[PDB]
RNA sequence: CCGCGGUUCUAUUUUGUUGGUUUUCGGAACUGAGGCCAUGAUUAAGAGGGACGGCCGGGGGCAUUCGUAUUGCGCCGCUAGAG
């Protein structure tokens, strides 16, 4: 009870971390072993007001931070990491601010579990944007 | 190729007293049974066609099936941003 569990210091609780790192945002979720329910999530657009900086690693290392706090502040300990890009038939690479977001949760007194990659890949996308010709810069 | 059967006609004869001539008279018309030919098919193209055997191949047509992605929908969670 109050904003926790009651187990004992045997035990360790596990959340569940994904991180959306893509260009021009990044988001940070936290929530139970199936997903289903959310304890906070905190992105780079709520955190800096400047428009540009929301995949900056400096947003995205305090989006990590808050979360961590809340996250402490409801007892998680231990925390299993699913990094996502943005998939589809886009970019399938994480974004600037995965690596800042990742260091901030571990030095924020956090624990980590096993980090793995639910990027969407199809087996083969539809159209993608941009025409044959490329976007002509 | 060689002889033996097997048809229709025809240059001439002179069986000089006319007549009848035998003129098969000579040769050419159609053919059956033969003999002989060393009897008679150049080779099978590092040309081609076709067959046969085991494969081989995102070759083609039809039918079936799988995959996540994207978009949309319905609930649940959570915040004011998301793009």
């Known amino acids: 009870i109050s904003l926790g569990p009651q187990v004992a210091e045997g035990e360790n609780v596990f959340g569940v971390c994904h991180i ?29 007001k400047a428009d540009r900086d929301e995949s900056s690693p400096y947003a995205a290392m305090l989006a990590a931070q808050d979360v961590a706090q809340r996250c402490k502040e409801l007892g998680i300990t231990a925390l ?18 995965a690596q800042s977001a990742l260091r901030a949760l571990a030095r924020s007194g956090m624990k980590i579990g096993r980090i793995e990659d639910v990027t969407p890949i199809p087996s083969d996308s539809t159209r993608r944007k941009g025409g044959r010709r490329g976007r002509r810069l």
Request: overall charge positive.
């Open 80 to 97: 299993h990491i699913k990094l996502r890009a943005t998939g589809g038939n886009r970019t399938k690479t994480p974004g600037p601010g």
């Open 20 to 48: 959306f790192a893509s260009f021009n945002d990044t988001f940070v979720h936290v929530t139970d072993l199936s997903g289903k329910e959310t304890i906070c999530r905190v992105t780079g657009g709520m955190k800096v």
